[PDB]
């Protein structure tokens, strides 16, 4: 949620999506680390990051 | 009874591709742990993929890398899984889920998908 305002984040991993854990291994209930960005060169005018 | 139509269940040549696609009738419009589970003769349940309706995250199993597609629609409410390149050991009935926030697992009737020479 709205951690500390000033911190440092290197989390990875799924967090929990479904009731039984990771067990360390992708699939079901895991999540990818960090979802991809990508614009492409001209979508939208004010939308580019 | 949470319904769940099925589509693009039928016959297929061997390294061929379908078109399927499930649909939910409405099932609160929000799930967490949608997956897709199938069910081969002679075998059980085995996971195969799952993606997120809050995101694009998207799960795939070990078999079931690159050449597997899965995204979902918020707007038709609907999931619309794409293949290639499918295998004789394939062969089995499919099954869409949507797992509802803190409820049991649903389940609908499925299709039955062979493929053969």
């Known amino acids: 949620s709205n951690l500390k305002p000033f911190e440092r984040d290197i989390s990875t991993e799924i967090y929990q999506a479904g009731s039984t854990p990771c067990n360390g291994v992708e699939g079901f209930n895991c999540y990818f680390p960090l979802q991809s960005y990508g614009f492409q060169p001209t979508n939208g005018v004010g939308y580019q990051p | 009874e949470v319904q769940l139509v099925e589509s693009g269940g039928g016959l297929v040549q061997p390294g061929g591709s379908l078109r399927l696609s499930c649909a939910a009738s409405g099932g609160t419009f929000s799930s967490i742990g949608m997956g897709w589970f199938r069910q081969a003769p002679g075998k059980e349940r085995e996971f195969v993929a799952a993606i997120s309706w809050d995101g694009g995250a998207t799960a795939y199993a070990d078999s079931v890398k690159g050449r597997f597609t899965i995204s979902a629609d918020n707007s038709k409410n609907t999931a619309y899984l794409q293949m290639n390149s499918l295998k004789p050991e394939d062969t089995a009935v499919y099954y869409c889920?949507?797992?509802?926030?803190?409820?049991?697992?649903?389940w609908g009737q499925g299709t039955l998908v062979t493929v053969s020479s």
């Open positions: 889920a949507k797992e509802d926030v803190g409820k049991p697992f649903d």
